[PDB]
Amino acid sequence: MKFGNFLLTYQPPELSQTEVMKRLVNLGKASEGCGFDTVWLLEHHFTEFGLLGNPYVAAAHLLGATETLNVGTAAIVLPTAHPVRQAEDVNLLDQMSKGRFRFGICRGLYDKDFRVFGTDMDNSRALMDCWYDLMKEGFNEGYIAADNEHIKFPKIQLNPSAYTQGGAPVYVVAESASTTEWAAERGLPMILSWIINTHEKKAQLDLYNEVATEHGYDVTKIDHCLSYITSVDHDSNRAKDICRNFLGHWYDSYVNATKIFDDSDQTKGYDFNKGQWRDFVLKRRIDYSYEINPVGTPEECIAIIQQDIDATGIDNICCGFEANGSEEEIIASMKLFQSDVMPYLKEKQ
Amino acid sequence: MKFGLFFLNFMNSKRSSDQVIEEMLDTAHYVDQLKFDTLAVYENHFSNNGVVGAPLTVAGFLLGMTKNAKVASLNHVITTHHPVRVAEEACLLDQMSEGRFAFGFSDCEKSADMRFFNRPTDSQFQLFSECHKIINDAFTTGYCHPNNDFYSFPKISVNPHAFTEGGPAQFVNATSKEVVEWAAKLGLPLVFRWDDSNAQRKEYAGLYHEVAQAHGVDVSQVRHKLTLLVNQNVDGEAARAEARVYLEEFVRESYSNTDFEQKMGELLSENAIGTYEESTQAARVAIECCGAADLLMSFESMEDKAQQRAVIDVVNAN
Numbered sequence: 200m201k202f203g204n205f206l207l208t209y210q211p212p213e214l215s216q217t218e219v220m221k222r223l224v225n226l227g228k229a230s231e232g233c234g235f236d237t238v239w240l241l242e243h244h245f246t247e248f249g250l251l252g253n254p255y256v257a258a259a260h261l262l263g264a265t266e267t268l269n270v271g272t273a274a275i276v277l278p279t280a281h282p283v284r285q286a287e288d289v290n291l292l293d294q295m296s297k298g299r300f301r302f303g304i305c306r307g308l309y310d311k312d313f314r315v316f317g318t319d320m321d322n323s324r325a326l327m328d329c330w331y332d333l334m335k336e337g338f339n340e341g342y343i344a345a346d347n348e349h350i351k352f353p354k355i356q357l358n359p360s361a362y363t364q365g366g367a368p369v370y371v372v373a374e375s376a377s378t379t380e381w382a383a384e385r386g387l388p389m390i391l392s393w394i395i396n397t398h399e400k401k402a403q404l405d406l407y408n409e410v411a412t413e414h415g416y417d418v419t420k421i422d423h424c425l426s427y428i429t430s431v432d433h434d435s436n437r438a439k440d441i442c443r444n445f446l447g448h449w450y451d452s453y454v455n456a457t458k459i460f461d462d463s464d465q466t467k468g469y470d471f472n473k474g475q476w477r478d479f480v481l482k483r484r485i486d487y488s489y490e491i492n493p494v495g496t497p498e499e500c501i502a503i504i505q506q507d508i509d510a511t512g513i514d515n516i517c518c519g520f521e522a523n524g525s526e527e528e529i530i531a532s533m534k535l536f537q538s539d540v541m542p543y544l545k546e547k548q
Numbered sequence: 549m550k551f552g553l554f555f556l557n558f559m560n561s562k563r564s565s566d567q568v569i570e571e572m573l574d575t576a577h578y579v580d581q582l583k584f585d586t587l588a589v590y591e592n593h594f595s596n597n598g599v600v601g602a603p604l605t606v607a608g609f610l611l612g613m614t615k616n617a618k619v620a621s622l623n624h625v626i627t628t629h630h631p632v633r634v635a636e637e638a639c640l641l642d643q644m645s646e647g648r649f650a651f652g653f654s655d656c657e658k659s660a661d662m663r664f665f666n667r668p669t670d671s672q673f674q675l676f677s678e679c680h681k682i683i684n685d686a687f688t689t690g691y692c693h694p695n696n697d698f699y700s701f702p703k704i705s706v707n708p709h710a711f712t713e714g715g716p717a718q719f720v721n722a723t724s725k726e727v728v729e730w731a732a733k734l735g736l737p738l739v740f741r742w743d744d745s746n747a748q749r750k751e752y753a754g755l756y757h758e759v760a761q762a763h764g765v766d767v768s769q770v771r772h773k774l775t776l777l778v779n780q781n782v783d784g785e786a787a788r789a790e791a792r793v794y795l796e797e798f799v800r801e802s803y804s805n806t807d808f809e810q811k812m813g814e815l816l817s818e819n820a821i822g823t824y825e826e827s828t829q830a831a832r833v834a835i836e837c838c839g840a841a842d843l844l845m846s847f848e849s850m851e852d853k854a855q856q857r858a859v860i861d862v863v864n865a866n
């Protein structure tokens with residue numbers, strides 16, 4: 200059983216940006232001591248929903264300060280940055296950490312990113328798809344060239360080479376059937392949402408496995424992750440209150456981030472990304488989600504997670520603890536998860 | 549004078565990119581308890597002459613593994629890059645290290661890189677200025693809001709806000725008279741480059757001082773930097789032969805339009821290369837020409853690691 204720690208770098212209104220940044224640093228360093236193998240970093244721009252916009256650079260820092268700890272992105276917003284620059288960053292992380300970087304990717308949730316960085320959210324799926332091929336071509340061959348509909352550039356030598364054969368291991372944040380299939384066609388592990396239930400998780404997996412098997416992948420050796428909002432407390436109802444209050448704030452912060460440019464001048468500057476635009480546009484609250492998350496007593500946490508393991512065969516459990524209050528109360532929540540939940544989870548029979 | 553190290557991270561057929569990155573990390577670890585004050589990282593793309601294209605990412609790693617040295621980008625190329633990414637990253641580094649990052653930046657030196665990243669060469673200098681303007685607005689206020697021909701998007705908080713009031717300390721690569729003048733008017737420190745001639749670096753130093761005077765900018769407390777290569781061997785002819793081989797592809801890549809032998813000869817006599825005596829004398833001359841208050845040195849052309857450390861120690865000691 201592997202354990203991950205999710206770090207959101209969420210800014211509650213009573214904390215300063217400096218204090219939130221110190222907590223990222225500290226919580227990353229505390230993680231190994233609490234029995235976590237991996238720290239996963241979320242990307243977000245411009246708003247308090249999350250203050251870390253560059254997980255490659257924050258991963259560099261934590262990997263630099265550590266030896267055996269793995270650090271991953273959950274997730275890089277793939278489309279909003281140049282695929283060759285990102286390949287350089289991944290290889291560098293891969294080289295410097297000697298193989299401890301985990302490369303989680305998504306299409307991106309917020310238009311504001313596409314707006315500022317100058318690319319098209321309506322095209323996010325095709326960009327994620329194309330950027331992935333170019334990166335993996337660089338990881339595999341040591342060179343990348345593009346002559347397509349989305350982007351074109353001459354062949355270049357990609358520096359440095361990949362430490363890990365085929366590049367650092369890729370994970371896909373996926374929660375549509377189409378992103379599931381995309382990941383499956385590639386044999387790539389998914390990081391599953393903490394807002395869906397066991398039945399939904401199992402159905403997403405069954406879908407994945409169908410396509411993955413057709414390609415010849417061993418579906419039993421793929422490092423899929425269950426992700427979780429987590430609040431372990433001997434007082435069950437206090438854990439639920441803490442998480443219910445947090446999920447309300449974070450959801451409001453998600454909403455605010457979707458509306459940030461709501462009444463603004465839509466004028467774009469120079470188009471450095473010409474092939475990336477499409478002519479046309481494309482054609483839910485989480486207040487009760489603590490019920491389907493390990494929020495409650497250790498025993499209750501054990502049962503929710505074992506139920507997910509038993510339905511999916513996943514043995515990589517990634518938990519977010521930042522709903523839990525001060526740095527001290529987050530660490531204490533991690534420590535109680537470590538002592539009273541970790542040792543009692545078992546792999547699917 | 550403060551003294552530091554920089555990393556070019558050149559590779560070749562027997563010295564893989566894997567190997568040189570490992571070398572740099574070991575070197576960072578070695579010098580961190582010494583009196584060198586800065587570790588600086590060179591940016592290069594698509595060739596053997598530098599395997600680091602993302603000096604801010606490398607900076608994060610170095611900062612995570614070290615405790616004493618400041619860590620700098622040497623020449624982060626802003627002209628080809630999104631300035632929101634740059635500002636975000638440099639502020640993140642500022643914040644994660646609590647103020648141990650210094651932001652060295654550069655205009656683009658290869659037009660091939662401009663084309664690669666679709667930045668028009670006809671307007672390279674105004675693009676550079678606008679990129680720096682956005683980065684500096686973000687460093688100084690936490691916000692930016694461009695409305696120009698290069699970048700136009702709504703007002704944004706650039707997160708995280710800098711840990712250091714005013715943002716991380718900045719310096720700019722002395723790459724053209726136009727850039728040198730721009731910097732002088734802003735009161736920004738320069739880095740002079742190891743691969744420029746002494747005459748060139750002197751010309752830039754003088755231009756700077758004069759533009760500053762003409763404009764009423766107090767530059768009396770501006771600390772310029774110089775970079776130099778160091779290769780010291782009691783066999784001085786061996787030091788020159790080793791640096792020759794190390795430098796050859798570079799001179800062919802970056803000075804293709806200039807005479808090979810004359811330029812090689814100049815790099816070898818003007819850099820801190822040769823016997824200890826020859827080496828330190830070239831350093832004195834190089835500093836006198838440009839007026840740099842801080843010296844950054846690369847020792848990487850010395851292939852024998854134990855020899856390299858011995859020269860780092862001797863240099864540290866005086």
Ligand SMILES: Cc1cc2nc3c(=O)[nH]c(=O)nc-3n(C[C@H](O)[C@H](O)[C@H](O)COP(=O)(O)O)c2cc1C
Pocket residue numbers: 241242243273274275276305306307308309372373374375376378379390391392393426
């Ligand atoms: C663990 C996890 C991490 C996520 N990280 C990010 C992120 O860093 N940036 C972002 O814009 N969205 C993030 N999201 C949302 C995804 O971008 C996306 O909306 C969705 O969950 C799955 O993508 P799909 O629509 O391709 O299926 C995250 C979701 C989860 C469950």
